[PDB]
């Protein structure tokens, strides 16, 4: 899962 938001996807 790439891109912006990637980090806090959940």
């Amino acid at each position: 899962h790439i891109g912006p938001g990637r980090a806090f996807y959940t």
Partner: antibody, heavy 121, light 112 residues
Framework: QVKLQESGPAVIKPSQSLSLTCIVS??????????WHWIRQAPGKGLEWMGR???????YYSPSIKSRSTISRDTSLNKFFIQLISVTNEDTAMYYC?????????????WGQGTTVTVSS | DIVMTQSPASLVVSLGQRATISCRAS??????????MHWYQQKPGQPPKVLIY???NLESGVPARFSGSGSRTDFTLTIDPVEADDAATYYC?????????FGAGTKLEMRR
């Protein structure tokens, strides 16, 4: 408006714990979308990424630091930290904390001055 | 993960001229049809300054003479006309997937 100030020890004996603190000021650690990073640049070398801690607590570490590192925050003081265990001369560097809009922008828009750290006896 | 390869490692360009720094990424740094790589400038003992984000977009304040181009794996910062101030190192960074990564830097020193 926003300020970030790194603080830490100028010098530290080899094989001891480096612990830096990044102090966001005039903006909160927890406003959504921002993730807060640590970047270090060993003298005469490139920037190298160390890890981030996103506004809601997700942490992520560069492999190389992963197993000798601990990124924690302090929501009430509005500061975050990093611990580097068993430092060596390759830890001697300039350490920076910066800010990222992780939802709309992807790039490091504010950066503290950076403190310097010399690992030496 | 992506390894970012800047080239040249250093270069000497004379005032009024054009410099062309290039940064190549081992894999695509694209998503939502945007290229999520950015260029930074670091005058000595200054934190990096953003110059250009998301491959083409100019940051406020950065002058006309900075041009962000490219996509997927091929990206070009172009400064023309070069002048005084641009004596600095320039880095490109991707931040499309973990961990984010930086180029090795290109030092611009310049001729008078």
């Amino acid at each position: 408006q926003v300020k970030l100030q790194e603080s830490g020890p100028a010098v530290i004996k080899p094989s001891q714990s480096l612990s830096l603190t990044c102090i966001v000021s005039g903006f909160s650690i927890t406003r959504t979308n921002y993730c807060w990073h640590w970047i270090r640049q060993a003298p005469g070398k490139g920037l190298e990424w160390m890890g981030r801690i996103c506004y809601e607590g997700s942490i992520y570490y560069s492999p190389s630091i992963k197993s000798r590192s601990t990124i924690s925050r302090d929501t009430s003081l509005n500061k975050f930290f990093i611990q580097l265990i068993s430092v060596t001369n390759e830890d001697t560097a300039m350490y920076y904390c910066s800010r990222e809009n992780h939802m709309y922008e992807t790039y490091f828009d504010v950066w503290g001055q950076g403190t310097t750290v010399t690992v030496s006896s | 993960d992506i390894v970012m390869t800047q080239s040249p490692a250093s270069l000497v360009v004379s005032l009024g001229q054009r410099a062309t720094i290039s940064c190549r990424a081992s894999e695509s740094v694209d998503s939502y049809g945007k290229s999520f790589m950015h260029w930074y400038q670091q005058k000595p003992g200054q934190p990096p300054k953003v110059l250009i984000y998301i491959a083409s977009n100019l940051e406020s304040g950065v002058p006309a003479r900075f041009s962000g181009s490219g996509s997927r794996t091929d990206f070009t910062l172009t400064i023309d006309p070069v002048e005084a101030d641009d004596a600095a190192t320039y880095y490109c960074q991707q931040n499309n997937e973990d961990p984010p990564t930086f180029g090795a830097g290109t030092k611009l020193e310049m001729r008078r």
